[PDB]
């Protein structure tokens, strides 16, 4: 079949969109007349000399903004700001209409946004600079739809989702072909957890433009992850890597996480698990050879090194991630969780419980941190406090499928005794969740269910005990066999009771 | 090991929030949208010549509903004869 790459959609497009759009050489006419100068951006282009030459020859503003775009691609944000500022000082823009000045103000707005994205710091200052530039652009020329797009992005960054949605509604009323409006709307809906609507918007953006930056296929893979169709997510991520082989390490990170999930939930045997896990580790290491300071990769590797009893290096990586990425609360919660897990081996119950509490306060979505907090409460013999905390968590999260939480609730209620019906409900839910997940059901839950049903229904208790015995197989103990024999004795099954006693 | 099993069940669900860096949209990223002031309109009208047919088959497979039938005609007003 036809190869799926960037060259495919290049050949689909006309040669005007193939060669001209990716030119690294800029043609600049001179003020003397027909004379022109061609400067290749592959070489080290000086910002000051190029700006002085452009100002002297008074070239068209398109060349200035194109050079600014190329220096953005080079990462020279300060150089691009210098280009924009000296362009505002140039004679051409001063003698042009306010539309050109508004476009360059919007370019400075995008420069502030790119600096904020590339640094993830000084958010308030860059946001104020971008807001002032966008306000100046809107005052000079309010008819530009790019000003509305910038207003919507500014609202989205400040979490003013309603106003940005209204702006994108106005843009859609103006024209339905705006790809950036669709991408911004999908970003807002994804932020509002409207995954399906953002998925249709991502599909529309992909159909309109398969070569649009940012990549819609990342959002399509995220939506497929939300809809459990992770195979199509991995396929779309591979296609994205084919289209964008550079500066797209996040796609490789998502592919590695999906591979880890597939290894965890699909490995049919220990050897296959070992092979898939080692392949995931090798792929993660290969991705690490490009960037060795990415905090998420260190957090992922911390799990493997914790499983390797390398607690010291886990502590070092966690402290490094805390020092670098203290702004992100999820990394703080994960680092606190791993520190609590490390201290659990040391049995620092107070310290581990405090770390779990800090992880919970940092990110409330970390269910594992709260379950570890409950486990630490059990460790400090705080049975009542753990029970109250578990009841609060269950009542707040009745839809959460935390099977181990329900198993622990059933065991605690069986120890209490008076709450036996809640124990029955939680153990039945645990059994159902384990059956749906195709995970080995713990026979201890069946033993607890039989003990509870002893005072309610001997038949159900005997059936659960038989199921537990079948699960154990050769691991049957004297207590289980004796209780089976007594059950058959009460059932007047003399032969079966005699066999179980034997 | 119970917490290890819980970690295996949860995996990296809540760690995908930071991975939303690709959702951010910036005008300067596209190479050919800026080369002329009206290059945005030129690129918007460059893909009207393309359609679903021009899409790669694997990317067409990615378009999954969350074939035409011969007996559903599109309505007309003048007919023929």
């Amino acid at each position: 079949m036809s190869l799926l790459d960037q060259d495919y959609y290049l050949s689909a497009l006309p040669e005007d969109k193939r060669a001209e759009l990716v030119t690294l050489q800029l043609t600049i006419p001179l003020k003397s007349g027909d004379e022109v100068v061609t400067i290749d951006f592959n070489e080290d282009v000086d910002v000051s000399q190029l700006c002085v030459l452009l100002e002297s020859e008074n070239a068209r503003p398109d060349l200035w903004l194109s050079a600014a775009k190329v220096f953005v691609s080079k990462g020279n944000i300060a150089g691009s700001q210098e280009i924009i500022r000296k362009a505002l000082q140039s004679n051409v823009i001063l003698d042009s209409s306010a539309s050109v000045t508004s476009l360059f103000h919007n370019f400075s707005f995008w420069l502030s946004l790119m600096e904020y994205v590339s640094t993830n710091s000084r958010e308030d200052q860059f946001l104020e600079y971008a807001s002032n530039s966008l306000q100046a652009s809107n005052s000079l020329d309010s008819g530009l739809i790019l000003n509305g797009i910038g207003n919507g992005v500014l609202y989205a960054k400040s979490r003013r989702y309603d106003e940005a949605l209204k702006e994108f509604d106005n843009l859609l009323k103006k024209k339905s072909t705006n790809i950036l409006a669709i991408l911004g709307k999908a970003q807002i809906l994804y932020k509002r957890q409207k995954y399906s609507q953002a998925l249709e918007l991502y599909q529309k953006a992909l159909t309109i433009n398969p070569l649009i930056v940012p990549d819609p296929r990342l959002g399509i893979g995220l939506c497929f992850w939300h809809l459990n169709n992770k195979q199509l997510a991995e396929q779309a991520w591979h296609n994205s890597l084919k289209v964008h082989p550079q500066n797209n390490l996040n796609t490789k990170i998502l592919i590695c996480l999906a591979k880890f999930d597939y290894c965890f939930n699909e490995s049919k045997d220990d050897d296959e698990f070992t092979a898939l896990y080692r392949e995931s580790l090798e792929f993660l290491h290969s991705c690490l050879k490009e960037d060795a300071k990415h905090p998420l990769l260190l957090m992922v590797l911390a799990s493997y090194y914790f499983s390797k009893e390398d607690y010291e290096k886990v502590e070092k990586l966690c402290n490094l991630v805390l020092k670098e990425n203290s702004r992100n609360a999820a990394f703080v919660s994960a680092s606190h969780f791993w520190l609590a897990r490390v201290a659990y081996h040391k049995e620092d119950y107070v310290q581990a419980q405090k770390q779990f509490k800090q992880a919970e306060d940092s990110q409330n979505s970390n269910t594992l941190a709260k379950l570890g907090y409950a486990q630490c409460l059990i460790a400090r013999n705080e049975v009542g406090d753990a029970t109250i905390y578990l009841e609060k968590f269950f009542k707040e999260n009745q839809d959460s499928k935390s099977s181990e939480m329900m198993l622990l609730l059933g065991i605690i209620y069986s120890q209490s005794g008076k709450s036996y019906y809640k124990a029955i409900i939680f153990l039945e839910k645990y059994v159902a969740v384990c059956q749906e997940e195709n995970y080995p059901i713990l026979p201890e839950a069946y033993l607890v269910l039989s003990r509870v049903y002893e005072n309610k229904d001997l038949n159900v208790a005997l059936d659960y005990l038989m199921k537990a015995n079948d699960i154990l197989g050769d691991k049957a103990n004297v207590y289980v066999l004796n209780n089976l024999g007594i059950y058959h004795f009460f059932r007047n099954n003399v032969s079966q009771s005699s066999d179980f006693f034997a | 090991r119970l917490l290890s099993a819980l970690f295996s069940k949860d995996n990296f669900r809540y760690l995908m929030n930071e991975t939303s860096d690709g959702l951010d949209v910036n005008y300067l990223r596209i190479p050919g949208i800026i080369e002329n002031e009206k290059s945005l309109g030129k690129l918007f009208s460059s893909y009207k010549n393309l359609a679903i047919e021009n899409l790669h088959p694997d990317d067409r497979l990615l378009l999954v509903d969350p074939s035409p039938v011969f007996f559903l005609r599109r309505p007309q007003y003048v007919s023929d004869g």
Binding site: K268, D270, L281, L288, S307, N438, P440 | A5, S8
Partner: peptide
Amino acid sequence: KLESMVKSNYRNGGLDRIISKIDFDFDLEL
């Protein structure tokens, strides 16, 4: 038989022991 075959040590809780049997060297800065 795939339902019973998938039930193994890592599902039973020996996941840490299985990972401990997998040795690999990384280029760690720390």
